Design a protein around this ligand. Structure first.
Ligand code: B1J
Ligand code: MN
Length: 460
């Protein structure tokens, strides 16, 4: 029974509005309703992994797991296995997988982050799950960010705190945050970004929605505008939105947006918004294709509609050779030529690189680079031909071309990372000098770039 090279992953996010779900929620898991929906012909075909994020979830873990498993069994006739469940207050993540994957899934981690301070600490934050699926690392974040149209900068701060403090994946990857630890990272939730249009335009927005004319609304979506200005979710993807705003509905129908200020809203307007979102970030040149992104029409217990997204995701096998794991394969090597880092820092410390990859027995430290003053005031750290030759554990090109090298540029003075990036080994050629490039980020913000050339030697 061969190992898969692709799986499908269902991501769901639903702010349940502290109400129990209705008796049938199968439309969510089938990707049916509005937007990019799943073909009817696929309805019986189970996804490999279902990741359910809820916010304002009033249920116990046991109660929700029973509903989820019985929903999936009804759809697929498969009894899904529980990989992980983690709850912070009323923010929950459930990961379910087909039973055939039980011996493919390992290194399961869970964590949460509480955002805010005093007044603003106690109900917002994020839960996350990570695990290995054979050779592939997968991370999942469900966040409930700060509410309110006039709090986009707080949401961006919440994002920055979650990606800095959520402790998932391989703890040896000490320079790297969750945005570099996984082959595929999915980040979803009630992100709470709003359509930034005047209050007076509420009924205009509603009439645009009823015409299915979303363009003038999406052009004011705070998440899209903050992402375009590189304020949040740098280097993440989101499928095009083709479904109506998922908030704020009158409960028990979907015919009515409830936007007006009420004592119950703290006298705030809740103009129709795409609060409920799914984004992803995958290592360079790994297959990931969004196959659905939409909202249900028939689940009306909450003032939010559920959102679904499904993905094809490339996965690799747990590779064994005669040599690695547990030794190197002399027939393999990774060389870096004419490499330099460009950093936004004012600092004048010397810098060194660390190279981290599961194709190495352990991470590799470089010698210090040569600082030059770049023309336009930047710091250029030149490594030229000084970088260590990396010795992968397996030389087979079917393995090595699927791997990735994480790079951290660290201060010699403090050993603190000034920038992290990732280089794919999925090269156009072996034994050939080829350009490489990654942006560098630190705690999610752009700090520079790393570029040069690479020369990969495989057994072939
Ligand atoms: O003790 C290790 C461990 C493995 N798993 C697990 C559960 C469900 C699936 Cl589908 C796969 C793996 N849970 N704990
Ligand atoms: Mn950090």
């Amino acid at each position: 029974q061969p190992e898969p090279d692709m799986i499908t992953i269902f991501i769901g996010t639903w702010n349940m509005g502290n109400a129990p779900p209705p008796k049938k929620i199968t439309s969510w898991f089938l990707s049916k309703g509005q937007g990019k929906t799943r073909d009817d012909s696929a309805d019986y075909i189970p996804h490999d992994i279902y990741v359910i994020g809820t916010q304002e979830d009033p249920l116990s873990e046991k109660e929700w797991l029973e509903i989820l498993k019985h929903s999936l069994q009804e759809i697929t006739s498969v009894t899904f296995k529980t990989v992980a469940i983690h709850t912070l207050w009323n923010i929950r993540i459930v990961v379910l997988a087909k039973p055939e994957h039980e011996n493919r899934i390992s290194h399961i981690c869970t964590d949460n982050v509480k955002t805010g301070i005093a007044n603003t600490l106690g109900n917002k934050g994020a839960v996350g799950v990570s695990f290995m699926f054979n050779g592939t690392s997968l991370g999942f974040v469900n966040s409930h960010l700060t509410s309110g149209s006039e709090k986009k900068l707080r949401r961006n701060q919440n994002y920055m705190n979650i990606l800095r403090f959520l402790a998932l994946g391989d703890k040896k990857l000490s320079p790297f945050n969750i945005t570099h630890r996984f082959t595929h990272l999915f980040w979803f939730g009630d992100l709470n970004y709003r359509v930034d249009l005047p209050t007076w335009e509420a009924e205009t927005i509603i009439q645009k929605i009823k015409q299915q004319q979303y363009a003038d609304l999406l052009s004011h979506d705070q998440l899209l505008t903050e992402r375009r200005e590189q304020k949040v979710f740098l280097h993440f993807e989101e499928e095009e939105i083709t479904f109506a705003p998922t908030y704020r509905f009158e409960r028990l129908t979907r015919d009515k947006y409830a936007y007006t200020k009420q004592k119950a809203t703290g006298m705030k307007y809740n103009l129709p918004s795409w609060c409920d979102r799914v984004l992803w970030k995958s290592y360079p040149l790994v297959h990931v294709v969004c196959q659905s992104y939409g909202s249900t029409s028939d689940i009306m217990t909450s003032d939010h509609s559920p959102v679904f997204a499904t993905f094809e995701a490339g996965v690799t096998s747990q590779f064994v050779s005669k040599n690695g794991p547990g030794t190197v394969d002399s027939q393999g090597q990774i060389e870096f030529l004419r490499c330099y880092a460009t950093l936004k820092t004012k600092s004048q410390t010397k810098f060194y690189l660390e190279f981290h990859s599961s194709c190495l027995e352990s991470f590799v430290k470089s010698q210090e680079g040569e600082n030059e003053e770049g023309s336009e005031g930047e710091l250029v750290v030149k490594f030229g031909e000084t970088l260590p030759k990396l010795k992968p554990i397996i030389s087979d090109p079917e393995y090595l071309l699927d791997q990735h090298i994480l790079i951290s540029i660290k201060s010699s003075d403090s050993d603190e990372s000034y920038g992290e990036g990732c280089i794919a080994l999925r090269l156009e050629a072996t034994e050939t000098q080829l350009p490489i490039y990654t942006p560098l980020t630190h705690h999610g913000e752009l700090t520079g770039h790393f570029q040069g050339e690479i020369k990969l030697q495989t057994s072939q």
